[PDB]
Design a protein around this ligand. Structure first.
Ligand SMILES: CC(=O)/C=C/[C@H](C[C@@H]1CCNC1=O)NC(=O)[C@@H]1[C@@H]2[C@H](CN1C(=O)[C@@H](NC(=O)NC(C)(C)C)C(C)(C)C)C2(C)C
Ligand SMILES: CC(=O)/C=C/[C@H](C[C@@H]1CCNC1=O)NC(=O)[C@@H]1[C@@H]2[C@H](CN1C(=O)[C@@H](NC(=O)NC(C)(C)C)C(C)(C)C)C2(C)C
Lengths: 305, 305
């Protein structure tokens, strides 16, 4: 028992991280087979980033302008191209440590692990959720761009996020591995606002099931509710609507505990309307929404990779 | 910016995990050079664990009784011995993925990463603190024994914890890699109590500095305090005494922010005496004590490995 915010093992991704330097800008790249993926602003000076024309900057670069280092080994660049907001550098050596992998575009509410890197070297790993407003609450400093986020399923790494920028209140934004931003953001240092964030209701419910499985049951009440009545209350407290798809996804946890989803909704409604009265759930004084139903099942059942 | 509970990259440790089976008991082992380390209760049936005589059980086992599998490869066992509560299985093949490593015995209040494993395969990574009562708040299921905890410094893995058991309220206990338990515990399924836990004061202070670095400053007051007066207040709220050694260790964070440690103590004292009044610090409604001063500096400065 116990319940912790748990990241995926990072070894398969660590073997893919490299350093990319162009001019005086250095960041991280992802080396898979004979291609290195990295954010396109590696070709910018800090002044260019205020208003960059990336297509124009790239045509003035040649293969040799890109210094790619995998540990202490320089990789020779033999081609380059831009796809949306990422650069693809073809190198003359395929990465022998390439895992089975896919590129995926995750949905808001889904979680992934972030391997934060500097100078092509990994510094730490942590779990994030894609917020409804298409940002993540990460931990990133200068030089962390090109750090990637990922999920693992058996042996296959699903890369879903590449880091590009920071927004007010220490919130982070980036792209999928095809270089398309999550959310209405562009890679330019100019005023841009994220939308209002909301609480991921299905994840809060998943975490309440995690609490019951761990024996923290004080918040279970004797009532049920309708899906429509629950969603009227959730709306007031800035919670996402709960859909029938969400109910079906919570099925395994509901079947394991014998607590119908609509009964857990009745308990969540009371917590929202009355607060926690100074009590905690799984050690937390606030409701947690960065565990998916699958995260809960994985941790409570011991899924390995 | 941003501040997250961050684990070390686990790749160097993943390459060392194996499965150990003896009779019908299976758990995890740590393969370094030509030795596999694992908890000695792998030689027990579930009935033996109620009151085991490990020395007697081991003399009835031969090398061939130990099935060690590294992925799909069986490793041939060519010798065995017991050191305190761990078994050392000599195998005929040295692990080619062995990192530079050391075995260390950590002190209460220090943090480490746990790589939770089942059947020799890694399932997730998370950061833990060794509590003052020599337990950790982990997440471990049946089959997780032999999972290890570690720190990384540059290229060197310092292994400090091997998992053995669970205590009431989902708290966990284990040994260093020489098989000596942290705390007054033994590897037997019989009534044993942990001591009262306390809050790690120097870590709370380190986390308040992390908050200031991230721009969460509302709790800074205009006062100072003496070390003696602070410790009189801390005692009432079940906080560890703050020592001059702790003050010196907080030096780098104090110098970075320009906030003397004794002034931060005055702010912590007010939080303890008055509460947070429904406000949060770094997103938390409770004071956090599982970040060391070094963890804060590492994350806020981008140390890599
Ligand atoms: C080389 C490398 O490794 C780069 C990685 C960092 C990660 C950053 C650093 C700090 N924490 C991170 O996560 N990316 C950048 O520096 C990006 C690149 C410039 C500006 N930028 C920002 O992030 C900016 N944000 C900003 O202008 N925000 C609004 C749009 C006004 C909302 C600043 C935080 C610098 C002001 C872009 C957008 C081309
Ligand atoms: C094969 C493998 O992989 C083993 C790993 C697990 C990890 C456990 C499982 C659940 N979560 C974990 O962390 N270890 C064990 O099962 C150990 C071994 C027996 C009993 N035991 C306990 O942990 C017990 N604790 C207990 O008796 N507690 C008091 C002393 C009364 C305080 C139970 C939780 C089973 C009751 C020991 C002590 C030789």
């Amino acid at each position: 028992s116990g319940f912790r915010k748990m990241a995926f093992p990072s070894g398969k991704v660590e073997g893919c991280m490299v350093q990319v330097t162009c001019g005086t800008t250095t960041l991280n790249g992802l080396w898979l087979d004979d291609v290195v993926y990295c954010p396109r602003h590696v070709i910018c000076t800090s002044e260019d980033m205020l208003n960059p024309n990336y297509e124009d900057l790239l045509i003035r670069k040649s293969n040799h302008n890109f210094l790619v280092q995998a540990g202490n080994v320089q990789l020779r660049v033999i081609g380059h191209s831009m796809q949306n907001c990422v650069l693809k550098l073809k190198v003359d050596t395929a990465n022998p440590k390439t895992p089975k992998y896919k590129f995926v575009r995750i949905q808001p509410g889904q979680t992934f692990s972030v391997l934060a890197c500097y100078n092509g070297s990994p510094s730490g790993v942590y779990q994030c959720a894609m917020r409804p407003n298409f940002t993540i609450k990460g931990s990133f400093l200068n030089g962390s761009c090109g750090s990637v986020g990922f999920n693992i399923d058996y042996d296959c790494v699903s890369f879903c996020y590449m880091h590009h920028m920071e927004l007010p209140t220490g919130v982070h934004a980036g792209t999928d591995l095809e270089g398309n931003f999550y959310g209405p953001f562009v890679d330019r240092q100019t005023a841009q606002a994220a939308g209002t964030d909301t609480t991921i209701t299905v994840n809060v419910l998943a975490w309440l099931y995690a609490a019951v499985i761990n024996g923290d049951r004080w918040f279970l009440n004797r009532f049920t509710t309708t899906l429509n009545d629950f969603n009227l209350v959730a709306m007031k407290y800035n919670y996402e609507p709960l859909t029938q798809d969400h109910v079906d996804i919570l099925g395994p946890l509901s079947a394991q505990t014998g607590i119908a989803v609509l009964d857990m909704c009745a308990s969540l409604k009371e917590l929202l309307q009355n607060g926690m009265n100074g009590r905690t759930i799984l050690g937390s004084a606030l409701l947690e929404d960065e565990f998916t139903p699958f995260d809960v099942v994985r941790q409570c059942s011991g899924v390995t990779f």
